Amino acid sequence: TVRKNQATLTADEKRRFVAAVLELKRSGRYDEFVRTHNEFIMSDTDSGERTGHRSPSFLPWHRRFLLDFEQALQSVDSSVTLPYWDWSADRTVRASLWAPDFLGGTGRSTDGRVMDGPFAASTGNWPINVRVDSRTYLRRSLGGSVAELPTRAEVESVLAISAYDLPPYNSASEGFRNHLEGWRGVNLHNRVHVWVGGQMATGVSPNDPVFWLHHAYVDKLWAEWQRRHPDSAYVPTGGTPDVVDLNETMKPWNTVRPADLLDHTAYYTFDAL
């Protein structure tokens, strides 16, 4: 029940995590996670109903989404937990995260095909099934579409924002949530998806295992923000059309509200907050 920095994992933890992920893929359970995220990424609009992205519920939604995935991983190997990627610290293509014994590196120039690691197409263990871009191999272009990943200083400026979110509660919004998501400002979360490239830059981003480590860190940043602003909390808090209010139930589950996911300690803790 402790999410650790991917950089701190032992060779054993890394082995077990990879094996559990590959088994969810083999059993066909993994692909359904990819499908769910794309469905929400395609229907979440600034003009209408938005639940998973560009709205205040972007955080509790991905929090529950990651909880589901982690629970699925634990059904395979109860010792595995979702590690996180601090892209502000481990910002180079040579981070241990991108080594052949963990996630593998960047793609080759010609077609962006990842050639090493346990998820390279050549292993026959990571078929890209849920997709839009017809190709079926994992693709990446680390730092190809955007020069740099966010820095600690930049993350600090976003964490400083006291307002959780602000009307019109969408991609035009000011406030912590939209700045963390990245639609406005120095851009944190969105820029990271772009930096990795490949499937990570698309709606079927969960096709890349790094998607989970990336969102595990975004999730931690929300935890760090709550620590900085104990006086601040989730908004809106009542009758706001097309937006999930604090005590409103969230799709696709419907049995959970942002109010139930505010405190992460009910499900897990971090190596350090």
């Binding site: 794309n38 990424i41 395609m42 609009t45 600034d46 003009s47 560009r54 077609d111 962006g112 997709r131 839009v132 871009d133 017809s134 190709r135 579409s145 019109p168 969408n170 991609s171 035009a172 990245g182 639609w183 979360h189 969105n190 820029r191 998806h193 772009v194 830059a201 698309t202 709606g203 981003s205």
Partner: protein, 72 residues
């Protein structure tokens, strides 16, 4: 006010756009696109990188695809 329609061949692929709120096609296959509050656009194959217009989003998709056929 929806954007104007367009039809051109970009990097060997035929891209078209038309108001519906707006549809885009790459070689006949529809590409999901979305408009942001500030007026910029994004497509399913470039969903975290806002571009100014629907044609910019279609050209971004052709760029991403690297020749590969789009799947419905």
């Amino acid at each position: 006010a929806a954007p104007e329609s367009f039809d051109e061949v970009y990097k060997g692929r035929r891209i078209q756009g038309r108001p519906a709120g707006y549809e885009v096609f790459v070689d006949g296959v529809q590409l999901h696109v979305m408009r942001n509050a500030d007026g910029s656009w994004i497509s399913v194959v470039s969903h975290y990188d806002p571009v100014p217009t629907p044609r910019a989003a279609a050209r971004a998709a052709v760029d991403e695809l690297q020749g590969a056929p789009l799947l419905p």
